[model samples]
Target: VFTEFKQMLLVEAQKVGDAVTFYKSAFGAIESGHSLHVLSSELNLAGSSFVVCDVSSLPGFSTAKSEGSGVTFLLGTKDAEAAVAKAVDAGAVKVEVTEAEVELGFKGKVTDPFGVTWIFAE
Candidate 1:
């Protein structure tokens, strides 16, 4: 095997549980608990790895606390429109209307409450 260690998206959040829950309810992320409190956690969203760490340990590093700035995650799926709607309903601000994809399917962008930009494509 070529490195079972998969590079993951490590994010800091004000509330780890909230971040994990948002990914779950918004994108059907499967939570993989690795913390004793709501301090930190892990999630799998459409086969992608995401780790959420509570930022209280290092204040001023949470995207949820500040603007996510230059980070973005592209999500490819079969229900891009539905996912966009679901994300918006869950507090994500619509940033882009559906448009041509880089190769195929429709694409759009939204910023979650944590200020992370997620590109949803079908």
Candidate 2:
């Protein structure tokens, strides 16, 4: 499932002319609970410039930590605000939203209904 998600992001990026860069990062703020793995990528399509998806893995169960059991969508957006809203509406209890003027995107952290935390950016 995790692999599928990664592949999906890659494919989606292609749709936008391979404008996004996919990468992995770490979430250190929420340190005590579990170390989190953040998968992020961004690209520009047409001229609007949009973020693809940012998925955060569960603590101690991310692609790097475990084989592949606990994984979640975390956050996504073709548009920044919409993605944050979707995550919140989809039962995210906690969310941190951020936007960079130079990056032209947004990033955030959210806890989903399934008790999985995700760090996403687009």
Candidate 3:
């Protein structure tokens, strides 16, 4: 049975600090908790919880380097254009796509510095 849900992302072995900082500055995420050595940190963004961890600490974990992570996180908002603007100003790259998303509801898409994709929808 499913009891709870949370998202986890692993970054470079020595890049956890910078990654966490970027996440906070870009998405307005607040630290909810953290582990010793700063190898793992929990963050909350608009009530959505996720963890950022160092890949070195995980025996079999690795990062998708120089490529898209193939996962797009959808953020529902009142103004996707504004959200996209904010993200782009914070180092995210806006992705160009056809307007076929009208039915899918997404208005814009961007990929963060960490290669994580985000889609904003109204």
Candidate 4:
């Protein structure tokens, strides 16, 4: 049986620490671990594992190409509206949620400073 799974965000060179700080302010995530002189960082958000890494510092990957990659992080929360507002204050651009999305408990969508999408679902 599978025991664990985690998602990672590949950021530009020397930006690993910056991304981690953004995540903390945007989502109130807790730092769980870090190593390799700030090349990588691990965070725990609502019991889920999240990671951020400096792609250029990793083997077989370059930040120049990986910069176009993407990930949509779906966050389930008690107050999507409040979450969106908080994230917006943390330097995220609100990407207007659709009516259908609101009906489905997805009240907001935002693109973070690092270009990662985040959906706030109630």
Candidate 5:
């Protein structure tokens, strides 16, 4: 029912760098520019690009206190276990270690150290 949608992640300086590092190490993300900081850092995964910005500069933007806010990043991976492992290694917490079966294959979830939630599916 939809032709396209926009996806971007806004985070605070206190966590933006860690977020970028976690994504890079866990999901094989690549930085789109030479910026040393995480501000406006474009992370590329699977063929799509998601922008990670510093929330301090973005007016009225704030980080979610919990996943109850209905925000979670779902990642489709070839190996759910590996993804979870990498994320954990990169300081992400294992909310759910088991990659359970689902309608669209297997999936698992975790909360990165920076505080956002992410689900990995194979």
Candidate 6:
């Protein structure tokens, strides 16, 4: 099951111009079972930027997080207002809103009831 899922992700990555490598690693024991965890940590050490982990191990794939600097979703300029509206409709609280003087772009922050904060921009 894990192998098939990993392969599909690799194929999809290839279509998007990503170079992927598979690693074999052992995660410590857990209550459910003992299993191997596929680990991939990519980094540009000089920049202090890296994605060291992903939540591909969780069941039903229910939750995820992009920690450190947080996650941002970019929308096109024309779609910015609509994107904010849609988020509001889906139960997000608008935290802050601003516009860029030079680019005439909109950006904002919102928090969903699940306690996840998102940075939205266009």
lDDT of 6 at 92: 60
lDDT of 1: 0.69
Clashing pairs in 2: 19-43, 20-42, 20-43, 51-122
Error of 5 at 35 (Å): 5.2
Please give each candidate's TM-score: 0.75, 0.31, 0.85, 0.85, 0.75, 0.33
Order of the predicted models by lDDT, top scorer first: 4, 3, 5, 1, 2, 6
Off by over 4 Å in 3: 1-4
Model 2, position 1: C-alpha lDDT score: 30
Q: After superposing candidate 1, which stretches have Cα over 4 Å from the reference?
A: 1-14, 59-65, 98-106
Which runs of model 5 end up more than 4 angstroms from their true locations? 1-6, 34-38, 66-69, 97-104
lDDT over C-alpha atoms for residue 119 of model 1: 84
Error of 2 at 67 (Å): 20
Model 4, C-alpha of 103: deviation from truth (Å): 2.5
Better of 1 and 6 by lDDT: 1
Candidate whose lDDT is highest: 4
lDDT of each candidate versus the true structure:
0.69, 0.36, 0.80, 0.81, 0.70, 0.35
Q: Which window of 10 residues has the lowest lDDT sum in candidate 5?
A: 97-106
Measured over all alpha carbons after superposition, the RMSD of each candidate to the real structure, in angstroms, is 3.3, 15.1, 2.0, 2.3, 3.6, 15.0
Q: In candidate 1, what are the lDDT values of residues 19-50, reduced to their tens digit?
A: 77788878888986667546667777677677
| Weakest 10 consecutive residues of candidate 6 by summed lDDT | 22-31
Q: Lowest summed lDDT over 10 consecutive residues: which window, candidate 3?
A: 63-72
Using TM-score as the yardstick, the better of models 2 and 6 is: 6
Superposed model 6: Cα runs more than 4 Å off: 1-69, 99-104, 114-122
